[PDB]
Every structure is written in C-alpha cells, then in structure tokens.
C-alpha cells in the first residue's frame, strides 16, 4: 500500500433516521447524518 | 499462468548461459522446500543437487522455505561442489527475483567458496 | 462483361499458356462444355456465349460460369512507336487450357442441352466438346 498518496481512511460512526447505526471507514469527514439505509426503506 | 510467465522470464538467461558453455547453478523456489542444482554445460547431467526436502538436511532448520532454509541449502551446495572439484559457476535466477530467498541462497553460496 | 474489382496491379506480364487444365470435371450442374483447344477468352466472348445459351434455354434451368478473365491485356494506340512504357489496359481475358470446363448447366433435358451448348461454342475461338456429369 503506497504511502502519502491515498486519502485518509479513518473510521467514522454513521446513523440514519430509522435508528440503525453502523461504523464505516471512509472519506466522508467529521460527521454524517442519514435518513434511510439497507433496511427501513421502501425498496 | 505463473509457470508460463516464469519460463518466459528465464529463457533468455538460460540460452545465454547455454551458448556461453559454463556450469550453471540453477535454483528452484516454491512456498516450501527451495531446491538447488548444478548443471553441466551440455545441460544433460546434474553434477550435484541439494535441498530441504531430504531428511539429511531437513532435520535441523525449524521450517523449510525461509531465509534460514535458503542459507542452509546455499551453504550445503557449497562444500558439495568444492568436494566435487568444480569452483566457478554461473547463477541462474530461473525467473525468480534476486531479492529474498534466492539472494540468501546465493549469498551463502558465494561466501562458502562458490564465487561468481 | 466480367471484370475484377480493385485489382492489386493495373498491368501484368504476358506469361505463357503452357500446362493443363485443373477444373476438368463437372462440379455444379449435370452438363458442361469442355475446352479441347488452348487459348484465351475475352470478356466479350464469354458474355456472347452466355447470352446465346440463356436465350436457347429460354431462362429455364441454371447456368454456371467456370471461367473469369482476371487478366488485363494492353494494346498500343494506332500510330505509336515502340517503347515509351507499357500500353494501356483494354480488355480482360481468361487463359484456357485443354480439358477446362467453360460453362455448366442443369435443369434441362439432355437433348435441349446439346443444342444450347452447340450455339454457345459457335461464338468461341477454341474447340469445345460436350460432357456430362460423371458418377465419382
């Protein structure tokens, strides 16, 4: 894995409106707010 | 294919040594039991071989297929070649990068008398 | 007026007509016209012979042409001295060796087939004979 060439991949906790919370490592930033997820959605 | 890529990689070196007409030290590497062989210029007979597959050399090193194993095999080929009489040889990578176990085997061999 | 399309070269050497024909057997129809003599057939001659048979058979049956010109022939213009390069292409000819099958035909009676081929051979510059499809 090359160094100082990739974006930061820090962990962050995200929760949606329907009460589902999960931890994901991404580049979103500081905080995230969601309304729908895999479940609790009219898919 | 891993084998096809490796053979293609080593073909030029093998041909160069073949036309040069000199005894060559050929090493075969796998996830376990690194091998080594000495081949006559004609390529038809094996002067001497060593490896960690035989109990005579596999009864000391903790695990076969590491840096320590390469040094043992590299050393093992040395005194065998010196005892046989042949001194100068040409190292053959056989398509294996000369970085880790292959380098360790060669380093052990060269410091043990088989200068090349 | 049979003629190739976008041939590789405009002109080619005269060559020679030695040898022996290859397509010596009927392969498509049941009757055919075999070449006895040796020579070359122009595109005009092939067209004239083809028209003669089609009229003779009254557009009944099938007609196969087993020869293609695929060979340009040049001719110097009148009142032109020798030299100054190869002449311009004028017409296309097909080299014919003995035994070559010129035309093949099927779907008509043998009796009507003989006269149709006889009319065509009358408009060709090489001795020809009538042949029938052989069993193997």
């Amino acid at each position: 894995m090359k160094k100082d060439i990739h974006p930061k991949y820090e962990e962050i906790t995200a929760s949606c409106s329907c009460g589902n919370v999960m931890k994901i490592r991404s580049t979103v930033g500081h905080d995230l707010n969601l309304d729908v997820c895999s479940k609790c959605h009219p898919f | 294919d891993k084998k096809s890529a490796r053979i293609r990689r080593a073909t030029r070196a093998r041909r160069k040594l073949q036309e040069l007409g000199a005894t060559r030290l050929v090493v075969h590497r796998t996830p376990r039991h690194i091998y080594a062989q000495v081949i006559a210029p004609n390529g038809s007979e094996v002067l001497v071989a060593a490896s960690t597959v035989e109990k005579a050399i596999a009864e000391q090193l903790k695990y076969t297929g590491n840096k320590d194993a390469a040094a043992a095999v590299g050393k093992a080929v040395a005194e065998r070649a010196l005892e046989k009489g042949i001194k100068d040889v040409s190292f053959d990578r056989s398509g294996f990068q000369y970085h880790g176990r292959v380098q360790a085997l060669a380093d052990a061999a060269r410091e043990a008398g088989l200068q090349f | 007026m049979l003629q190739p399309k976008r041939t590789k070269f405009r002109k080619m050497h005269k060559g020679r007509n030695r040898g022996l024909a290859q397509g010596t057997d009927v392969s498509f129809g049941s009757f055919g016209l075999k070449a006895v003599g040796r020579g070359r057939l122009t595109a005009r001659q092939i067209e004239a012979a083809r028209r003669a048979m089609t009229r003779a058979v009254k557009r009944q049956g099938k007609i196969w042409i087993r020869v293609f010109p695929d060979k340009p022939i040049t001719e110097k213009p009148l009142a032109v001295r020798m030299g100054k390069g190869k002449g311009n292409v004028e017409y296309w000819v097909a080299l014919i060796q003995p035994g070559k099958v010129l035309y093949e035909m099927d779907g008509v009676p043998e009796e009507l087939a003989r006269e149709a081929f006889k009319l065509a051979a009358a408009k060709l510059p090489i001795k020809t004979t009538f042949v029938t499809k052989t069993v193997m």
Binding site: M1, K2, I5, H6, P7, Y9, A14, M22, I24, R25, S26, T27, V28, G29, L32, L34, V36, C37, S38, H41, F43 | - | -
Partner: protein, 177 residues
Amino acid sequence: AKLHDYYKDEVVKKLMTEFNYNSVMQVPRVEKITLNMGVGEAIADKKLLDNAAADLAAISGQKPLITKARKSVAGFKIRQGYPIGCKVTLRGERMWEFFERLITIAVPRIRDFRGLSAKSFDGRGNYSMGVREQIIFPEIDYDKVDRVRGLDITITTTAKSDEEGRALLAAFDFPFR
C-alpha cells in the same frame, strides 16, 4: 470486513447446501471490484480530469489511475496515448468495506428508484451497473461539485456461469427487480 465474516459464517454453507458441491472452494467468491469513469471530454477541458479523479478517491479508498486510449480513432478525435478516463480496482479487505457502503447507503439513495437490475450479467458470472449522480455516496456535499457525470461499477467473481453468480448475489440480499 463484517460481511466477509458474514460470508464465511453461513453464506458458504448456504452456497454449499443449495449447489451441494463436492468441495468447499467450488462455491463462487468475489475477488475484486472495479470502478470505471469514461469521462471522454478531456479534449474539451483536460483540467477537469484531476477533480474527476478526486471524487473517485472520495468514493474509493485509494488513488485512481488515469487510463489512456488504446488507439486513435478519427470518429472521436482522440490520439493514441491520450488520457480519456480513469479507473479503480480494489481487492483484499478494502473491497469489503466499499461493498458495505454500496449495499447499505448507496442503493437506497438512488433518485427515482425502481429496483436493481437482474439481467446485467456478462454471461460468465460478472455483474456490472452504473449510477446517475455522485450524491448517492455520502462523500459529496452538493456544493463542492457541479457536474452531472456518473460512474460505473463492476464486481467480478469466480463463478463459472450466471446461475451461480446470480444465486451468490441473491445471498447478498440484492434487489434484482
């Protein structure tokens, strides 16, 4: 990584029972995922390539590489060796977390959603699809980007045919409408 444990926990057994294979490795398994972005408009403005690469780094966990034209074609005014797109291939562990983000936060956020397609198979077991806009992924704030360009996704597995690939994907609760 969590679904990788989920895959190793009973999905392999689910694959085992349904296809009653002889061995365990016979079950299909994903090995890598690939992201493509055929921008195409590098000729009009090559400056946008860098930012077009940047967002893919936002969705992905690593730096993309810019692909160059295989050959020059007069119908597109593109010369050989000219960058006209970028791609990303992710495997190992990082693919799993991205697969989570796609299957949990991305698919539901599709504008005018109707259902994930089930006929998008190459005929050997590899799945491909595309997206209209970037805001589906959370890494876009709607104010730092002003482009409508989309991207393509493609997941490749060791399936020998579509039937096991579709069955394997179904085990991952794919919509397949």
